Amino acid sequence: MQIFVKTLTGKTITLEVEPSDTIENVKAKIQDKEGIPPDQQRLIFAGKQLEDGRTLSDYNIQKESTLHLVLRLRGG
């Protein structure tokens, strides 16, 4: 299924995922399209952060959901 990943800069990125993919998979696709390393990416959906060991299905993310991508704070 497809899902929408909205960025801080107002851009909308389009992904093709499968329910069983883990959150680290999704950040990794964001990297091959935008170059943003996974360690710097935060996925927020409905006000709640998404965890790398969890799956898209564990958060009840369905077709055409809009996931919000927020960048991590400064760490040095």
Swiss-Prot record:
Phosphorylated at Ser-65 by PINK1 during mitophagy. Phosphorylated ubiquitin specifically binds and activates parkin (PRKN), triggering mitophagy. Phosphorylation does not affect E1-mediated E2 charging of ubiquitin but affects discharging of E2 enzymes to form polyubiquitin chains. It also affects deubiquitination by deubiquitinase enzymes such as USP30. The modification ADP-ribosylglycine is found at G76. The modification (Microbial infection) ADP-ribosylthreonine is found at T66. It is found in: Cytoplasm; Nucleus; Mitochondrion outer membrane. Changing N60R: Decreases affinity for UBE2R2 in CRL2(FEM1C)-UBE2R2 complex. Changing R54D: Decreases affinity for UBE2R2 in CRL2(FEM1C)-UBE2R2 complex. Residues 1-76 form the Ubiquitin-like domain. Changing R72K: No effect on ADP-ribosylation. There is a cross-link at G76 (Glycyl lysine isopeptide (Gly-Lys) (interchain with K-? in acceptor proteins)). The modification Phosphoserine is found at S65. Changing T7D: Impairs ubiquitination by CRL2(KLHDC3) E3 ligase complex. It is a peripheral membrane protein. Changing G76A: Loss of ADP-ribosylation. Impairs ubiquitination by CRL2(KLHDC3) E3 ligase complex. No effect on ubiquitination by CRL2(KLHDC10) E3 ligase complex. Changing R42E: Impairs ubiquitination by CRL2(KLHDC3) E3 ligase complex. Impairs ubiquitination by CRL2(KLHDC3) E3 ligase complex. It comes from the Eukaryota. Changing T9D: Impairs ubiquitination by CRL2(KLHDC3) E3 ligase complex. Changing K48R: No effect on HLTF-mediated polyubiquitination of PCNA. Impairs ubiquitination by CRL2(KLHDC3) E3 ligase complex. There is a cross-link at K6, K11, K27, K29, K33, K48, K63 (Glycyl lysine isopeptide (Lys-Gly) (interchain with G-Cter in ubiquitin)). Exists either covalently attached to another protein, or free (unanchored). When covalently bound, it is conjugated to target proteins via an isopeptide bond either as a monomer (monoubiquitin), a polymer linked via different Lys residues of the ubiquitin (polyubiquitin chains) or a linear polymer linked via the initiator Met of the ubiquitin (linear polyubiquitin chains). This is Ubiquitin. It comes from Homo sapiens. The chain holds residues 1 to 76 of 685 of the full protein.
